[PDB]
Amino acid sequence: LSTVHPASPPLLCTREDVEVAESPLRVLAETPDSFEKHIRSILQRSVANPAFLKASEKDIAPPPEECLQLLSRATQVFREQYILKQDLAKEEIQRRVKL
Amino acid sequence: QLESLINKWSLELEDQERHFLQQATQVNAWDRTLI
Amino acid sequence: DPVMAGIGEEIAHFQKELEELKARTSKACFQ
């Protein structure tokens, strides 16, 4: 990444709407990135799985138990840091497109 | 072997992350048009 | 071996969750 991104403010969409004459969206025209940056905030990872070097054609085969814990560590990080945030981004785009 | 499933599932989730960003770019264009 | 079986069933479950995620994203016709 070309930039060290700090973490964004907490979720600009815990708003209840109020009608008098004007659209609540006028404030979101002032910055061209506004909604895409809110989705890019919801997608912001705080743990990831490292890229693993392949095992060699001279390595010892590990115990199955190490391989189960390495798998569960990896699938937990995918469930908590990717899948959950992508369904939250989907509900946000569903709410925005409806409005 | 397991390494080559985990490294693959990372890239196949970062691909869906890139799809959700482009969907947000497309909504932003209709958002302004309706303002 | 049962550890070598549970590893197979989580690999089958998690890739099913990833394909049912892709099948929940590709059906999101936002227009």
For this PDB entry, the determination method is cryo-EM
What spatial distance separates the first Cα and last Cα of chain B, rounded to whole Å?
53
Largest separation between any pair of C-alpha atoms in chain B: 53
R_g over Cα of chain B = 16
- Length of chain C, please? 31
- Length of chain A, please? 99
Residue ranges of A 20-79 with Cβ closer than 8 A to chain C = 64-65, 67-68, 71-72, 75, 78-79
Instruction: Count the neighbouring beta carbons within 10 Å of the beta carbon of residue A15.
Output: 8
What spatial distance separates the first Cα and last Cα of chain A, rounded to whole Å?
33
> Closest by alpha carbon to A25, among B28, B24, B23?
B28
Given a contact cutoff of 8 angstroms between Cβ atoms, the answer to whether A64 and C3 are in contact is: yes
B12 in contact with chain C, both atoms CB, cutoff 8 A: yes
Nearest residue of C to residue A91 by CA position? C28
- Rounded distance, CA A35 to CA C3, Å? 46
Q: Which residues contact A71 (CB under 8 A, 6 or more apart)?
A: B2, B6, C7, C10, C11
B23 vs A1, B16, B17, C17, CA distance in Å? 21, 11, 10, 21
